[PDB]
C-alpha cells in the first residue's frame, strides 16, 4: 500500500501518476502566517482543486507533491484539495535548498529521526504519513546537504519509502548523489534522479539508467521562450524547447531504459519562494498546468511513434513500482 | 494608546507591572514546534517548563514578559496564549523577521514586509487574533541590504501603529549605530526603539551616546555567561566569558551617567532551544537555575547592594517599559 494525504491505497488505485508536483511552493510556516501572499488561503486551494481537476480530466489520478518541510508543504492543504479534486496525493518529508537553523544545525542522526517520524508516524499532528522522501543538492554536494542524503538513504532503508531528487544536471550533479547513495548501501531502484531534463548529455542520463537509477524528466513544461531580458524568467527557465526536453523520453526508451523513466510537470498553483507574482510568469508560459504532461507530451511521444503500451508503462506501472515501498 | 496587545488580549499598562522586555519561551525555526515537538520532548514537555519557569518568575515578582521571538525564530503564539494563561503572566507577543529569514521573505520588498508587520500587529498573527504589541529586527554589524529593508518596514510599522521596536546588535562591532542611522532616515523617534544585548559590550561611550540620542538601551542578556565553562565552545560563543555582575555593573553605569531612564534589564531567557545545538537548554539551566528570576532575585538584590535607590530600580522595571510599550504616535 502507498500512503495518501487521505490514508493508504493499493497500487491499482494510484493509475496515471505524477511523480514530481507541487500544490504550493513556499517556506515553513508562510502560508499559515501570510495567506494573502496568495489572496487568500481559499483562493490558492480553489484555484489548486480547479488544476487538479483539469489534470485528472485529462488521466491524471495520483500527483506525488515532494514540498517539504522547507518548501513551506502544508498537508492540511493537501488533505482538503485532493478530497475536493478526487485526485490522490502523496506527501512527502525530506529538505530542500532553504533549512532554517534548528534544520541546518541538526546531525544525520537527528535528520534520520525527523524524516522517520514524518514517514511511520506523521507529518505535524494531522497523521498523514509521508509517501516519499525529497532531497536537493547544488552542485557539487555541501556537507549539510550530504547529511540530507545520508539520512535520506537511511529512513528509505528502514521504510522502503523511496528517495526523489533535485539536482543541477547541468553539473551532473546526479553522479554526487549516487555516490553517497550507494555507500550508504541504497539500492538506485529506489531513487528518482531529479530535473533531468534540464540537460542535452544524454550520456550522463544513460550512464544512471544503466546503473538502476530512475530518471525524473520532470520539468518539460518549463522550458519558456521569448524571455531573455527577464532577469527572472530565464536564469529560473530557460530557451531550449519543451519538444528537445520531451525527446530525451524516446531517447531513453530506445535505450532499452523505458522502466527507469519518470515523467512530470513540477507544476503549481502557488509560490512564494520566488519574485512576487511569478506565479503569473509561470501561468502565462504554460497554461496547461499539471496537464501539459498529458496533452502535450504523451500526444507529441505518440506521433514520434510511441505505443500506447509504452506509454502507459512510464506515466502508470513505474511509478506504481517507485512509490509501494519495498525493501 | 495607553492599552497594549497581550496574547490574552489588551491590557491597561498599570496592569503591566514589572516586565521584562527581552524574552522567549522557546528559540526556535519557522513551523518546527508543530513538525517536530518530540524534540523538546513534547510539545506538552515544553508546555509544562515554560509554565514552572513562569510562575517561579511571577512569585518573585514578574508580572510581565516580551516574547521577542519572530516568524523565523519559530513563535508559536498559541504556544504562549496557553502557558501565559496557565502561569497568569502577561505576554507581549512580537512581529519582525531575526536572522533565519527564508526565501519567501528574503525576496519581499520593504514594502510587502511592511504589509507582513502590520497584519501582525493590527489584524493578528496567523488565524489566532492575537495581535503582536513589539517589532523585533535583528542585523549583523554591517547592515545587510535585507536587513536594510526590514529596519525601514519595521520603522514605517511602528510609525503607523505606535507600537516600539526592539533590536538584536552586535554590540562589540557597535552595530546600533548603523541601526539608528537606519531608523531615523525613516523618521521613527529614537524613544521608540530599544537597542538590544547592549550589554555585551563594556564601550561605556557607545552605550551613553545612544541613550543621550534617546533610545532605549537593552541590557538584556544579563545571566550569559560560559565562566566556568570555558571547555565549551559552544557555551563560550552563545554566553561569551564576561560575568553576569560584569554585565550588571553596566546598569549601575548607566544610571551613575544620568540615563536611569534609557534602561531596560531582561534575560533573554528561553524554555526551549532547537536553534542552537543539541542540548543547549541544558547548558543554560546549569549556569543559570533561577532562570527568568534571574533579574529579580539576583541583579535586582546586587545593584541595591551597590547603593541603586529602590525607586530607581522601580522606575527601569516597570516605568520604563511600561513607556516604552505603550503605543505612542
Ligand atoms: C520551488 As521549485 C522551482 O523546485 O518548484
Ligand atoms: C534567540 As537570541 C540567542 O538571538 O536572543
Ligand atoms: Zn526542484
Ligand atoms: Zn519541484
Ligand atoms: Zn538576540
Ligand atoms: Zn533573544
Redesign the interface.
Given at each position: 500500500r502507498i500512503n495518501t494525504v487521505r490514508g493508504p491505497i493499493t497500487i491499482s488505485e494510484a493509475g496515471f501518476t505524477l511523480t514530481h508536483e507541487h500544490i504550493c511552493g513556499?517556506?515553513?510556516?508562510?502560508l499559515?502566517?501570510?495567506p494573502?501572499?496568495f489572496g487568500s488561503r481559499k483562493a490558492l486551494a480553489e484555484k489548486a482543486v480547479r488544476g487538479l481537476r483539469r489534470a485528472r480530466a485529462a488521466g491524471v489520478r495520483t500527483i506525488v507533491d515532494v514540498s517539504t518541510?522547507?518548501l513551506?508543504r502544508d498537508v492540511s492543504l493537501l488533505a482538503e484539495v485532493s478530497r475536493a479534486a478526487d485526485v490522490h496525493i502523496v506527501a512527502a518529508t525530506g529538505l530542500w535548498l532553504?533549512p532554517?537553523?534548528?534544520?541546518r544545525?541538526?546531525?544525520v542522526e537527528?535528520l534520520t529521526?525527523?524524516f522517520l517520524?514524518?514517514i511511520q508516524y506523521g507529518?505535524?499532528?494531522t497523521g498523514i504519513r509521508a509517501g516519499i522522501i525529497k532531497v536537493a543538492t547544488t552542485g557539487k554536494v555541501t556537507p549539510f546537504q550530504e547529511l540530507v542524503l545520508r539520512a535520506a538513504a537511511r529512513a528509505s532503508l528502514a521504510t522502503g519509502v523511496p528517495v526523489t531528487t533535485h539536482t543541477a544536471a547541468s553539473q551532473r550533479g546526479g553522479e554526487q548523489q549516487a555516490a553517497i547513495f550507494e555507500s550508504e548501501g541504497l539500492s538506485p531502484s529506489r531513487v528518482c534522479i531529479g530535473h533531468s531534463d534540464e540537460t542535452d548529455d544524454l550520456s550522463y542520463l544513460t550512464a544512471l539508467a544503466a546503473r538502476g537509477y530512475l530518471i525524473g524528466l520532470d520539468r518539460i513544461p518549463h522550458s519558456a521562450i521569448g524571455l531573455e531580458d527577464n532577469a527572472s524568467a530565464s536564469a529560473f527557465m530557460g530557451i531550449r524547447s519543451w519538444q528537445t526536453r520531451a525527446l530525451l523520453i524516446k531517447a531513453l526508451i530506445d535505450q532499452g531504459y523505458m522502466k527507469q523513466i519518470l515523467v512530470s510537470n513540477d507544476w503549481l498553483f502557488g509560490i512564494?519562494?520566488?519574485?512576487?507574482n511569478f506565479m503569473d510568469v509561470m501561468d502565462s508560459v504554460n497554461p496547461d498546468g499539471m496537464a501539459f504532461i498529458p496533452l502535450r507530451v504523451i500526444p507529441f511521444l505518440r506521433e514520434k511513434g510511441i505505443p500506447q503500451e509504452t506509454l502507459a508503462g512510464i506515466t502508470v506501472t513505474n511509478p506504481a513500482r517507485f512509490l509501494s515501498p519495498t525493501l
Open positions: 513556499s517556506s515553513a510556516g508562510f499559515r502566517a501570510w494573502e501572499f518541510f522547507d513551506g532553504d532554517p537553523l534548528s534544520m544545525l541538526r546531525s537527528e529521526q525527523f517520524r514524518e507529518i505535524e499532528d512564494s519562494s520566488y519574485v512576487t
